[PDB]
Design a protein around this ligand. Structure first.
Ligand code: 8RQ
Length: 150
């Protein structure tokens, strides 16, 4: 192992996702909320979202996290797979994280204008979100969530 592998593990160790929610960006209405740390790697998490989320033009996510470790450029890469095929890739930057801080991170997730959504009934249980946590180019964790539309 290198210093960077050790550092990634230290960050993971100090990290906790405390709560999260999703809102319709246009109306502000709450679609989903949870307190399960979906960032925990090595386990396939599940989440149930209302099927009307697929009609939204944009979704606002609020994500609350704690970190014992300082981070220079905290960021996420998320890949949206349907039956193993990547259909969307999202990138979000938080930036600098104070050691032993708790932070609320708001992001906007926008519908790709190129594409049209398959129906909820087709998508449900066949969508995996793969999320990669980075400090800059240091990969901290990789986690998966399987989505159901209800
Ligand atoms: C392809 N389209 C070409 C699709 C569409 C499904 C993707 N999402 C649709 C909405 C995206 C923005 C515009 C409005 C439509 S989705 O509703 O299925 C959706 C919404 C939110 C998220 S998530 O915020 O990434 N997230 C998963 C998550 C995991 C780990 C962390 Cl750390 C944070 C967040 C939430 C999902 C429910 C729990 C949390 C993902 C997908 C497809 C499927 O191919």
């Amino acid at each position: 192992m290198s210093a960077k592998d050790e550092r990634a593990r230290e960050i993971l160790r100090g990290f906790k996702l405390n709560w999260m929610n999703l809102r319709d960006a246009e109306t502000g209405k709450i679609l989903w909320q949870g307190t399960e740390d979906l960032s925990v790697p090595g386990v396939e998490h599940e989440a149930r979202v209302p099927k009307k989320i697929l009609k939204c033009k944009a979704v606002s996510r609020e994500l609350n996290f704690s970190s014992t470790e300082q981070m220079e450029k905290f960021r996420l890469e998320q890949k949206v797979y349907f039956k193993g095929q990547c259909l969307e890739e999202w990138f979000f930057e938080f930036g600098f994280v104070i050691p032993n801080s708790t932070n609320t991170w708001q992001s906007l997730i926008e519908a790709a204008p190129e594409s049209q959504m398959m129906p909820a009934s087709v998508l449900t249980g066949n969508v995996i979100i793969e999320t990669k946590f980075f400090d800059d180019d240091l990969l901290v964790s990789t986690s998966r969530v399987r989505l159901f539309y209800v």
